């Protein structure tokens, strides 16, 4: 019921062509290797893929492993940052908090909250994947959050992104270092996202 929705997650921005088996094997292996499972065996029970909108719902064997799984928001799978979110009709169970107790080194969250230091990157070649765009930005250091915007129709980048660095103080060096860089046949725009936000 309510309990089943506390055992499901939306997984968006899934790569083209992924089977249910590959998604399951990836999550099961990574959760166990990552130490996120709380009992022996595989934590994922089921996977339902919608290839038309590039998302899956994952179903887990337990409520607490579902919550821990949210620490994989932004994990890279075949070059793409998976977006992990609660079901819209999730309601937390009494005596449970809805966010995880664990941080997985190297996972960069896809949630980029509005802030003084959040950046907008525009002008990206739209054939560069999430990891390839992250590798660009991380020439100024580790990212704290990042999302590349995709076109729900080409299965493809709309050519702009948002991010936030771990180090506050690199923000101006990043704009300075990237604003206007030529990239194949296009020049980069980089600025604080508050500047062109509708
Ligand atoms: Na709990
Ligand atoms: Na546009």
Residue numbers in the entry: 143 to 340
Give me lines lifted from the publication on this model.
Biochemical characterizations of U2AF65 demonstrated that tandem RNA recognition motifs (RRM1 and RRM2) recognize the Py tract.
The protein and oligonucleotide conformations are nearly identical among the four new U2AF651,2L structures. An extended conformation of the U2AF65 inter-RRM linker traverses across the α-helical surface of RRM1 and the central β-strands of RRM2 and is well defined in the electron density. The extensions at the N terminus of RRM1 and C terminus of RRM2 adopt well-ordered α-helices. Both RRM1/RRM2 extensions and the inter-RRM linker of U2AF651,2L directly recognize the bound oligonucleotide. The N- and C-terminal extensions of the U2AF65 RRM1 and RRM2 directly contact the bound Py tract. There, a salt bridge between the K340 side chain and nucleotide phosphate, as well as G338-base stacking and a hydrogen bond between the backbone amide of G338 and the rU3-O4, secure the RRM2 extension.
